[PDB]
Design a protein around this ligand. Sequence first.
Ligand SMILES: COc1cc2[nH]ncc2cc1-c1[nH]ncc1NC(=O)c1cnn2cccnc12
Length: 280
Amino acid sequence: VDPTHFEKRFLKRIRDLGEGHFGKVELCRYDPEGDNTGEQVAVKSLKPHIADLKKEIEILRNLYHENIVKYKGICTGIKLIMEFLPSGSLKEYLPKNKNKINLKQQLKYAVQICKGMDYLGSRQYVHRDLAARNVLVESEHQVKIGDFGLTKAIETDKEYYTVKDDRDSPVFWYAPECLMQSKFYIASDVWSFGVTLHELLTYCDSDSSPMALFLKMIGPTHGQMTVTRLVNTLKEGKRLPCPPNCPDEVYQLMRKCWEFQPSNRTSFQNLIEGFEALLK
Ligand SMILES: COc1cc2[nH]ncc2cc1-c1[nH]ncc1NC(=O)c1cnn2cccnc12
């Protein structure tokens, strides 16, 4: 018996956790005894991309970090089995838990996301989808990167992966090089982290989301010209505003994520040092 091979007949669906465009995550109980005593697991499957899910499974199987969701196995068509984190995504958790989470805890979550991302970068991978909706809450003290659906390998001595299909792109979290040439560097993930940090600091408020704020900056009636207008505004040096009640020193670290050139752009190691200095 392979402990990473889950039989479909014992995988009992409890409820949906969330869904994207092509995939969904469900809470299941892996119950081989048939008495509802088995382990609860999160199960990722595609909506009725198969090649892309198989590649994602192999990436997650080889990632081992305290701030990266734990791979548990597969159910072979294929389903990805992972550990279940009851508090859900940061996007759902933060609006309901503002009383429990203060600035100090937000900065500790920030460090933890940087550590998981720095580990991913060390394994030569680029995430391409770093947003609060992809960060999971293990407890009020810990977060983990919880999805690798768009993750791609960066070639040795190369700075980037060349994206062919831009159709599932979160453009309001994307660096200018991603928008203009679909060039994905580890530096492009640092840009997206800065956007995720803005979300975390606003408690993932929908009205102050990166999409809502950029649309107010560029105008919301540009239709197919929207990304072009977003590129123009970023070239002008305009950036997302400072979250209410966010100290200028934290906003300054955020601004360093948004240096136009993917060179004036810092590393995750550099950001960790910044946040730790603010925590002491
Ligand atoms: C990262 O969250 C998601 C990832 C996705 N991919 N496709 C759909 C999709 C949906 C979610 C999602 N949207 N709202 C909550 C969640 N996820 C969880 O509650 C969850 C708990 N443990 N767990 C383990 C692995 C992945 N997800 C989880």
